[PDB]
Amino acid sequence: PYLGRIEIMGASRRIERIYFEISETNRAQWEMPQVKESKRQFIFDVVNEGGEAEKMELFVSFCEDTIFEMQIAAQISEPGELEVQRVKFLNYLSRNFYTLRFLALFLAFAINFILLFYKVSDSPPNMVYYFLEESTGYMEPALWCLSLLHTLVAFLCIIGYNCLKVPLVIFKREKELARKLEFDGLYITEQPGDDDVKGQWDRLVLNTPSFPSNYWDKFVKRKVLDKHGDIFGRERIAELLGMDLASLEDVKYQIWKFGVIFTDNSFLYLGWYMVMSLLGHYNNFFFAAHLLDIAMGVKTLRTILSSVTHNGKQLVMTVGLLAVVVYLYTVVAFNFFRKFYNKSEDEDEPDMKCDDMMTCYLFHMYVGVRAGGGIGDEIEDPAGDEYELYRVVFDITFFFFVIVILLAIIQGLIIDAFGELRDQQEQVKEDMETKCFICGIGSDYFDTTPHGFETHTLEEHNLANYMFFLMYLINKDETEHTGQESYVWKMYQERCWDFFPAGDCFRKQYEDQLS
Amino acid sequence: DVKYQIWKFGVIFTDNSFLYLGWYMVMSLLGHYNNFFFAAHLLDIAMGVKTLRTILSSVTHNGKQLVMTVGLLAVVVYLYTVVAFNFFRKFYNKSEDEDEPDMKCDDMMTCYLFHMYVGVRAGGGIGDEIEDPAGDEYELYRVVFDITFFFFVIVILLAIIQGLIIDAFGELRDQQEQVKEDMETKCFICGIGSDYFDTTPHGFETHTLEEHNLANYMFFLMYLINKDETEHTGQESYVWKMYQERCWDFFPAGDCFRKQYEDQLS
Numbered sequence: 001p002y003l004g005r006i007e008i009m010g011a012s013r014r015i016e017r018i019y020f021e022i023s024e025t026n027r028a029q030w031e032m033p034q035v036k037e038s039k040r041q042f043i044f045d046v047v048n049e050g051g052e053a054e055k056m057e058l059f060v061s062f063c064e065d066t067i068f069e070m071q072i073a074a075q076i077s078e079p080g081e082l083e084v085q086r087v088k089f090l091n092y093l094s095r096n097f098y099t100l101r102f103l104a105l106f107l108a109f110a111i112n113f114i115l116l117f118y119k120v121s122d123s124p125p126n127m128v129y130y131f132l133e134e135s136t137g138y139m140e141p142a143l144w145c146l147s148l149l150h151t152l153v154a155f156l157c158i159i160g161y162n163c164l165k166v167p168l169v170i171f172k173r174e175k176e177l178a179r180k181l182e183f184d185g186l187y188i189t190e191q192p193g194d195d196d197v198k199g200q201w202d203r204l205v206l207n208t209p210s211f212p213s214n215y216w217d218k219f220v221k222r223k224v225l226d227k228h229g230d231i232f233g234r235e236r237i238a239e240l241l242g243m244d245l246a247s248l249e250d251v252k253y254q255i256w257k258f259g260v261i262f263t264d265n266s267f268l269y270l271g272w273y274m275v276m277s278l279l280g281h282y283n284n285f286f287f288a289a290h291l292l293d294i295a296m297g298v299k300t301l302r303t304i305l306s307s308v309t310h311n312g313k314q315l316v317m318t319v320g321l322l323a324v325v326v327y328l329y330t331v332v333a334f335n336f337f338r339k340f341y342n343k344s345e346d347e348d349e350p351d352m353k354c355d356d357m358m359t360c361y362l363f364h365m366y367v368g369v370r371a372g373g374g375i376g377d378e379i380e381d382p383a384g385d386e387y388e389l390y391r392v393v394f395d396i397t398f399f400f401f402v403i404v405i406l407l408a409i410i411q412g413l414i415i416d417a418f419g420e421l422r423d424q425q426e427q428v429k430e431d432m433e434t435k436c437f438i439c440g441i442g443s444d445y446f447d448t449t450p451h452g453f454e455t456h457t458l459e460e461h462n463l464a465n466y467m468f469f470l471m472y473l474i475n476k477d478e479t480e481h482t483g484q485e486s487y488v489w490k491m492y493q494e495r496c497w498d499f500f501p502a503g504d505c506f507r508k509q510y511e512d513q514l515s
Numbered sequence: 516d517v518k519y520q521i522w523k524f525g526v527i528f529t530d531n532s533f534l535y536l537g538w539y540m541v542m543s544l545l546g547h548y549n550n551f552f553f554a555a556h557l558l559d560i561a562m563g564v565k566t567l568r569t570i571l572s573s574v575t576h577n578g579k580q581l582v583m584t585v586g587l588l589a590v591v592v593y594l595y596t597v598v599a600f601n602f603f604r605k606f607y608n609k610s611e612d613e614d615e616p617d618m619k620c621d622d623m624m625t626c627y628l629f630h631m632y633v634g635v636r637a638g639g640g641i642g643d644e645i646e647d648p649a650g651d652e653y654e655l656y657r658v659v660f661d662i663t664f665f666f667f668v669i670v671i672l673l674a675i676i677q678g679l680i681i682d683a684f685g686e687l688r689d690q691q692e693q694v695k696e697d698m699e700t701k702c703f704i705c706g707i708g709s710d711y712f713d714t715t716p717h718g719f720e721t722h723t724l725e726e727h728n729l730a731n732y733m734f735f736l737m738y739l740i741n742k743d744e745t746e747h748t749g750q751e752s753y754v755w756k757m758y759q760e761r762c763w764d765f766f767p768a769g770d771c772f773r774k775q776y777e778d779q780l781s
């Protein structure tokens with residue numbers, strides 16, 4: 001239950017097994033369903049768009065993100081007066097962030113249910129008047145209290161997000177910047193261009209005293225100095241990083257953090273939610289924009305809409321193609337078929353829709369594309385004229401190419417998106433169930449022993465066990481490190497992932513003795 | 516055993532097939548009160564014909580996604596209703612008479628009903644059902660309104676529904692194909708692939724029909740259950756105890772007689 005075992009390619013050039021204790025809180029926080037979903041999304045991402053060389057780097061990054069999330073969850077878990085009450089309230093919002101997010105979705109549907117009882121009258125209950133019409137009389141007070149409650153809940157959602165999810169954003173940003181500083185020399189040798197807005201903005205935090213505040217590595221500045229001093233000037237590097245080399249013998253940081261947060265998509269969405277909730281008090285119908293949150297909420301709806309967004313570039317390109325081809329038909333009509341576009345039944349005021357190129361394009365794009373039979377179901381009958389056969393060819397080509405072919409292209413794009421997403425999921429599942437994540441040896445090898453692959457993935461090469469070992473190493477002070485622990489610790493500090501068993505396992509190595 | 520009988524009655528009355536047959540009997544009884552209640556028995560073709568049940572499995576396979584897409588259509592049509600009720604109220608007069616205007620969007624409930632009904636059952640959307648926008652100051656806004664309705668509701672969402680059905684057809688087909696492929700390329704009992712047994716001609720067929728026939732395992736369970744324990748032989752009693760303990764290690768997992776004694780069979 002607590003005996004966590006891994007296999008690492010050791011210093012002796014042989015696969016060896018390491019044993020460590022897994023904490024119960026860490027085990028429960030791993031079994032948490034949000035963490036399970038994070039793991040599932042990571043696995044899908046890697047298997048779908050990943051590489052063999054990049055896989056271990058991505059896996060270690062995912063483990064580090066998970067470890068930080070576990071620490072945040074432990075901080076917010078259930079345990080002068082102003083500070084003690086503030087901490088409890090802020091932690092309460094973080095533990096209940098998703099309940100508030102679901103509470104705001106119920107308040108959006110509750111409010112929009114009231115709005116269906118609206119009416120418009122010229123006379124008060126020329127400026128028109130809007131009012132709720134209900135005999136119960138409780139709908140209007142319910143609407144008022146529900147709008148106030150909804151704005152309150154949106155604000156609480158923003159605060160809970162800032163206390164829950166913003167730390168991970170800052171941790172990711174700091175660790176990426178530290179890695180670019182140390183193992184790439186980005187601001188020392190590379191100096192990113194103006195096109196990298198993120199790289200240009202990150203220059204603010206280098207000089208700050210508390211540059212690492214969420215990322216656990218408190219020796220990043222020392223390591224960057226030690227690596228790049230002899231090559232780029234110790235005094236220059238110290239001035240760049242805001243570190244006093246003589247002592248070796250935060251408004252700027254806060255502004256940087258605010259920029260990082262305000263460039264975050266989820267925070268921007270929550271701010272938009274709060275803004276529209278504030279405008280819902282100026283006009284009640286602005287609360288209808290919160291119904292759009294069902295997409296960002298319900299996972300079923302998000303999966304359904306992924307079929308639309310998967311080929312979104314092809315969909316907009318096909319719409320532009322439809323616009324071009326309807327322009328071509330408009331050219332042909334405006335030059336040869338102008339007389340058939342009279343939309344006025346009166347014999348005194350002809351309402352020609354194709355005596356102008358802009359008007360004929362608007363008429364085509366609107367009515368000939370929304371019509372079932374094309375533009376021939378909307379313009380004058382061609383029979384009897386000299387251009388009858390030309391008009392028939394015109395209408396039938398419009399019907400075939402625009403009504404049939406192009407709408408078929410759009411619908412086929414959606415259907416192909418459904419099929420492609422299904423087979424992506426199937427391929428990820430097949431890879432995971434037929435191959436090992438850590439070593440890549442197929443299940444056929446392990447299945448020689450009954451339940452061999454399940455035993456291998458649950459005991460020997462459990463990626464969860466590797467994550468728990470990283471937690472163990474990070475938490476354990478280096479003084480108490482054992483030999484193999486220090487070997488793996490140095491390989492992790494150098495960002496070298498050769499200690500992961502690649503294509504070799506304990507059974508494969510010692511099958512001779514296990515026979 | 517009144518308590519046992521009441522328990523059995525509860526178990527039966529919570530059974531879906533028995534409940535369906537009771538519903539059939541109830542509607543047949545009501546067919547004597549009104550003859551047209553016998554039309555509900557035509558629905559039994561689905562629970563009957565296997566072809567019809569397979570066809571309807573395409574509809575029910577993505578049923579959750581279908582109802583979610585219907586709810587999404589309802590939400591987006593509500594949004595269009597909001598925009599119409601606030602900016603396009605004058606185009607929703609459905610009365611040709613010049614004395615009694617039958618406005619369909621002076622009320623939020625009425626405009627939602629009008630949208631959900633006619634703009635979704637219309638081929639061109641709500642612009643094929645409301646007043647022509649040409650000549651008004653809001654002409655371009657109304658054109659954008661109608662064309663977005665046509666693209667998003669008429670085209671995109673109905674395409675989502677039809678794609679859900681088509682993907683259900685394909686998914687069910689490939690499920691059947693994968694089951695057939697697994698059965699014809701691997702052994703049910705031991706899991707050793709047909710490639711191993713095919714070294715001997717007709718080796719896999721011989722293995723599945725003679726050596727590891729799941730039907731033979733079923734018949735052996737019949738044999739063990741029917742045979743009184745006094746007459747059990749040694750291996751029979753071994754398997755009997757393993758079956759009483761619900762331990763299934765006596766099934767050959769990854770090993771077979773040929774694999775074990777290939778040295779002597781050579």
Ligand SMILES: Nc1ncnc2c1ncn2[C@@H]1O[C@H](COP(=O)(O)O)[C@@H](O)[C@H]1O
Pocket residue numbers: 432433435436437438439453454457458461462463464
């Ligand atoms: N190195 C690995 N560690 C853990 N599970 C693995 C590994 N490689 C493949 N798997 C598979 O991943 C799945 C884990 O199930 P789940 O935790 O529900 O995603 C099982 O099918 C395992 O056989």
Ligand SMILES: Nc1ncnc2c1ncn2[C@@H]1O[C@H](COP(=O)(O)O)[C@@H](O)[C@H]1O
Pocket residue numbers: 698699701702703704705719720723724727728729730
């Ligand atoms: N252990 C097994 N026992 C019997 N049939 C098996 C077994 N493993 C695979 N099969 C296959 O199952 C199919 C039996 O055909 P049927 O009885 O019509 O379903 C054949 O393709 C067999 O090769």
Ligand SMILES: [Zn+2]
Pocket residue numbers: 436437438439440441456461505
């Ligand atoms: Zn492995």
Ligand SMILES: [Zn+2]
Pocket residue numbers: 702703704705706707722727771
């Ligand atoms: Zn077999």
